[PDB]
């Protein structure tokens, strides 16, 4: 399965990786504006790990 997220859609701090294991990109969404527009599904990201630096 692959979540409907991406680098912009992803929460800042959470590292998004693909299903294979390849690192896609870390989320860097601004925590001020209501996240709604930047919610396009990226057919590359499968899961994002937040508890990881």
CATH number for 47: 3.30.60.30
Query: DSSP letters of 13-51?
Result: TPEEE-SSS-EEEE--B-SSS-TTSS----TT--EEESS
C-alpha R_g of the chain = 10
Q: Rounded to a whole number, what is the distance in angstroms from the first to the last CA of the chain?
A: 24
**Residue 29 and residue 10 in contact, taking contact as beta carbons nearer than 8 Å:** yes
User: Range of 39's domain?
Assistant: 1-53
| Close Cβ partners of 2 (under 8 Å, ≥ 6 residues apart) | 19, 41, 43, 45, 46, 47
Method: NMR
How many domains does the structure of the chain reveal? 1
- Alpha carbon 23 to its chain centroid, in Å, reads 11
Identify the CA nearest to 47 among candidates 22, 12, 28.
Answer: 22
- The four Cα atoms 52, 42, 10, 50 give a dihedral, to 10 degrees, of -20
| Residue 1 CB neighbours (<10 A) | 5
């Amino acid at each position: 399965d692959r979540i409907c997220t991406n680098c912009a859609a992803g929460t800042k701090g959470c590292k998004y990786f693909s299903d294979d294991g390849t690192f896609v990109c870390e989320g860097e969404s601004d925590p001020r504006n209501p996240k709604a527009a930047p919610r396009n599904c990226d057919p590359r990201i499968a899961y994002g790990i937040c508890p990881l630096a």
